[PDB]
């Protein structure tokens, strides 16, 4: 892992020492090479997970997130290349440094063995994200959005610090290899239920839950683009990974401390997909869809079954890819119209025939198209929820319907129909922003072809 | 001022605390505190304006009463035991009176109403001294008697300092008061743990000094005393935004910066002694302490404000003000978390 | 008013450099960024990674497990043994409490 993160660190010299006209190309190529070198830890010929040192490790859960975090950096990097092109070069290099820092910190999170390393990095990620949203966003509510995003997460995380301190003072190590082999069952006291809540209401803030998700649309709308990519793709998964790692030392409380959150996730998933169904801002449509999809993962982890964890990992990676793709697709029109409203441009597929295929495939991925790792995840967690209770499918089907509806409607009223003849500035396309969608969609096809990698602990 | 006077006054300020440390006699500790008191005033009052006169009067009148209360405690101890040292088996009333007087000396709430005013009424220097060099010897008194202290009101004073510092610094446009309320909150963090492993008090003190001194220098470099004055920094001194950002985000304890280390290990050593929920309250109000730092670095760094036409002369002319220790103190802060076991 | 510059009207690129690729304003940097991205993104990553991943042997012990299962059911059904007994640990090395 050290061989993966040290090159990511030396990418910062490669930014600040390279000339202004050879500072995107070199860093992008070398970031692709880091994404390549981050495929050796797929070499799992044996059931025993990979431990390189006391610091870092790698499991069938951590490794997909590692590879995706490495992959999304070039995409961030080229999507952030058409805007801030007339910006000063020091400002460019500062942006590149912020993204590389995010990459490094997130890989250090997913590879970590202790919970406090995970905590400090999980909470260190907030600084680059805040900077990206506030310094490079275009609107004026970016400040309130960064405030929301920062303080929701901190309010959630501080009880987690206290609970982890309690666990360290009880056990001694706070390391994950040992806390699985030594987990005495809990007395089911009010104090231990508070401990459960403290451990869980830092990730549930971030996944997010329907009671607390208002930080997510405010940030997605106003994160320039790459903030939306990361904040949809891996920063929500930073809560899923954390819940899966921490739920091992909390049995049997999860059998009854989970009911409110399973329930809130399901109902608020319907509510958020309904919000998606009737919405003016496209980058908020994607946001509420992200809430609706992460709620299923919350419910799945709360059920804590093998199929459920499997489908949760599948849906994690699939949603990350497809949501980053949708954000890039909407930015492709924002860079011409400079307006996020969807009804403005409502007659494309004349000028943009090829981009309208990426729209279609992304939507078919957003909804449950069967030969795809999205429907696999949704279907396995639905089977889990049915084994839990046979009445959850009543909710899941309503959401399936709504998720077909808002996706097809988005396609229709953004592409299909009469062209806006009053839009001369609808430039045809960029090879850059076609390669973005290609690099997003081809991994989905390949993971669907070989999904033995996209499972997790239980397979 | 003239050089002989400055030598005298600065030497007296150096010897106040240095007498207060190397002194077993509590009477000589009191002497050192009075030296600091007596010698700081000529420099609080060096500009000779009503704000400076009021600041110096408030400082003198607030510190003299605390000095007299500490002397009452010392005289009572001598009457009780015939010794000029706080042994064990003294009176809790004596020890608590001492602690309250020292709290009035530092600035801890509810004895905090004098520090923001005084720090507002004086230059950027002598706020630095007032917040760093004058906190040390009062802390030395507590450090030398940490087992004798009441765990109850020590923590009530701490918690009150945290709450009041956060809610004070939330709404201050003047920076000389924001730094004072930060001082109040940090002294709360110190004095909470002072009966528990007092080395962490000195840790938080050194961290707080290493943060505040660069900050006061940053304000010195353009005589900044307002949010709207530090907001005109992308035009005057635009290479300081990075360090100001990282040091404010250190003052508000965030993980990768070393300003989260004191809060973290303080909560650790409190959770070791079952001070769970008080620690939770302090940790949660530190976020309210962080909010105005976030607003501040928004105002100056991330959403660069309108400037003036006369600020272009500043661009023409040159500066010599950064003293080569700004960089060092700002880089030992913001970047020295992995050396935490070497710090503790 | 407060002396700010005006809203810069929208620029079209392809009027200049109709071979614009989306990357830079210099025609050479455009080319040498798209070439590098295509190369280092498809030609080596998406190809060699796919091959490297396709040729990982016994990913999480799948072929080995089926092979062991084949020989084990062979043994158990040749010897007429109970295939996949109902308890992983035998009670010969377990000690329960009384009452």
């Amino acid at each position: 892992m050290l061989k993966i993160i040290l090159p990511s660190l030396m990418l910062l010299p490669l930014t600040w020492l390279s000339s202004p006209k050879k500072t995107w190309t070199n860093v992008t190529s070398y970031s692709f090479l880091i994404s390549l070198t981050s495929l050796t830890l797929l070499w799992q010929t044996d059931e025993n997970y990979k431990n390189f040192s006391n610091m870092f490790s790698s499991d069938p859960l951590s490794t997909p997130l590692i590879i995706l975090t490495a992959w999304l950096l070039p995409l961030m990097l080229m999507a952030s290349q058409n805007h801030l092109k007339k910006d000063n070069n020091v400002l460019q290099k500062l942006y590149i440094s912020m993204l590389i820092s995010l990459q490094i910190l997130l890989i250090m999170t997913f590879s970590a063995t202790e919970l406090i390393m995970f905590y400090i990095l999980f909470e260190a990620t907030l600084i680059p994200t805040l900077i990206i949203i506030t310094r490079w966003g275009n609107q004026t509510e970016r400040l309130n959005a960064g405030i929301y995003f920062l303080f929701y997460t901190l309010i959630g995380s501080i009880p987690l610090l206290i609970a982890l301190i309690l666990i360290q003072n009880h056990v001694g190590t706070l390391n994950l290899m040992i806390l699985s082999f030594t987990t005495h069952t809990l007395d089911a006291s009010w104090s231990n239920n508070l401990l459960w809540l403290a451990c869980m209401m830092a990730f549930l803030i971030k996944m997010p839950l329907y009671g607390v998700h208002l930080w997510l649309p405010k940030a997605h709308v106003e994160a320039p683009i790459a903030g939306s990519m990361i904040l949809a793709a891996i920063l929500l998964k930073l809560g899923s990974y954390g819940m899966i790692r921490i739920s091992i030392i909390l049995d049997p409380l999860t059998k009854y401390m989970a009911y409110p959150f399973i329930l809130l996730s399901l109902w608020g998933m319907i509510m958020t997909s309904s919000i998606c169904l009737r919405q003016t801002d496209l980058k908020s449509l994607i946001a509420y869809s992200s809430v609706s999809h992460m709620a299923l993962v919350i419910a799945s982890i709360m059920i804590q079954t093998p199929w459920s964890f499997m489908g949760a990992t599948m849906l994690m990676i699939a949603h990350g890819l497809t949501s980053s793709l949708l954000f890039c697709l909407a930015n492709s029109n924002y860079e011409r119209i400079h307006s996020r409203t969807m009804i403005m441009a409502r007659g494309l597929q004349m000028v943009f025939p090829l981009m309208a295929t990426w729209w279609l495939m992304a939507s078919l991925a957003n909804l449950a198209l069967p030969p795809s790792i999205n429907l696999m995840g949704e279907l396995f967690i639905t089977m889990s929820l049915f084994s839990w209770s046979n009445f959850t499918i009543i909710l899941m089907g309503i959401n399936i319907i709504i998720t077909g509806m808002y996706s097809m409607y988005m396609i229709i009223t953004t592409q299909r129909g009469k062209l806006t003849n009053h839009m001369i500035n609808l430039q045809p396309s960029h090879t850059r922003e076609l390669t973005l969608m290609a690099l997003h969609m081809i991994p989905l096809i390949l993971l669907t072809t070989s999904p033995k990698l996209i499972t997790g602990l239980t397979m | 001022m003239n050089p002989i006077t400055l030598a005298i006054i600065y030497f007296t300020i150096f010897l106040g605390p240095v007498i207060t440390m190397s002194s077993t006699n509590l009477m000589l500790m009191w002497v050192g505190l009075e030296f600091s008191l007596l010698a700081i005033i000529p420099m609080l009052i060096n500009k000779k304006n009503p704000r400076s006169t009021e600041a110096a009067t408030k400082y003198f009148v607030t510190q003299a009463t605390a000095s007299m209360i500490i002397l009452l405690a010392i005289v009572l101890n001598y009457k009780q035991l015939g010794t000029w040292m706080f042994q064990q088996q003294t009176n809790g009333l004596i020890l608590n009176m001492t602690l309250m007087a020292l709290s009035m000396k530092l600035g801890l709430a509810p004895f905090h109403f004098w520090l923001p005013e005084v720090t507002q009424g004086i230059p950027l220097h002598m706020g630095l001294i007032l917040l760093t060099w004058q906190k040390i010897a009062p802390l030395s008194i507590l450090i030398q008697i940490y087992p004798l202290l009441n765990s109850t009101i020590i923590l009530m004073l701490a918690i009150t300092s945290i709450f009041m510092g956060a809610w004070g610094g939330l709404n201050q446009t003047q920076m000389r008061k924001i730094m004072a309320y930060s001082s109040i909150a940090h002294m709360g963090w110190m004095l909470a743990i002072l009966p528990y492993n007092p080395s962490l008090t000195l840790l938080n003190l050194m961290i707080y000094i290493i943060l505040t001194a660069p900050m006061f220098m940053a304000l010195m470099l353009n005589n900044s005393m307002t949010i709207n004055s530090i907001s005109l920094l992308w035009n005057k001194t635009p290479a300081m935004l990075t360090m100001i950002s990282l040091m404010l985000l250190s003052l508000g304890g965030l993980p990768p910066l070393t300003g989260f280390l004191p809060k973290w290990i303080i909560i650790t050593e409190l959770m070791k002694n079952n001070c769970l929920i008080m620690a939770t309250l302090m940790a949660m109000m530190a976020l309210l302490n962080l909010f105005f730092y976030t607003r501040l670095i928004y105002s100056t760094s991330l959403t660069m404000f309108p400037t003036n036409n006369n600020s272009k002369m500043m661009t023409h002319q040159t500066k010599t003000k950064p003293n080569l220790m700004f960089s060092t103190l700002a880089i030992m802060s913001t970047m020295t978390l992995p050396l935490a076991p070497q710090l503790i | 008013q407060w002396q700010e510059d005006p809203e810069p009207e929208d620029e079209n690129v392809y009027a200049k450099n109709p071979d614009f690729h989306g990357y830079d304003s210099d025609p050479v940097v455009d080319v040498w960024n798209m070439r590098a991205v295509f190369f280092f993104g498809f030609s080596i990553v998406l190809v060699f990674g796919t091959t490297f991943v396709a040729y990982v042997p016994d990913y999480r012990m799948q072929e080995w497990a089926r092979r062991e299962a084949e020989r084990l059911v062979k043994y158990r059904e040749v010897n007429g043994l109970p295939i996949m007994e109902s308890n992983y640990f035998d009670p010969s090395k377990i000690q329960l409490p009384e009452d």
């Binding site: - | 709404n171 404000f305 309108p306 | 407060w2 809203e7």
Partner: peptide, 19 residues
Amino acid sequence: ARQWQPDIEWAEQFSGAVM
């Protein structure tokens, strides 16, 4: 169309001595 940076009605709300 352009990045929003503050204006006078934004900067003035930090000039009231109490906020």
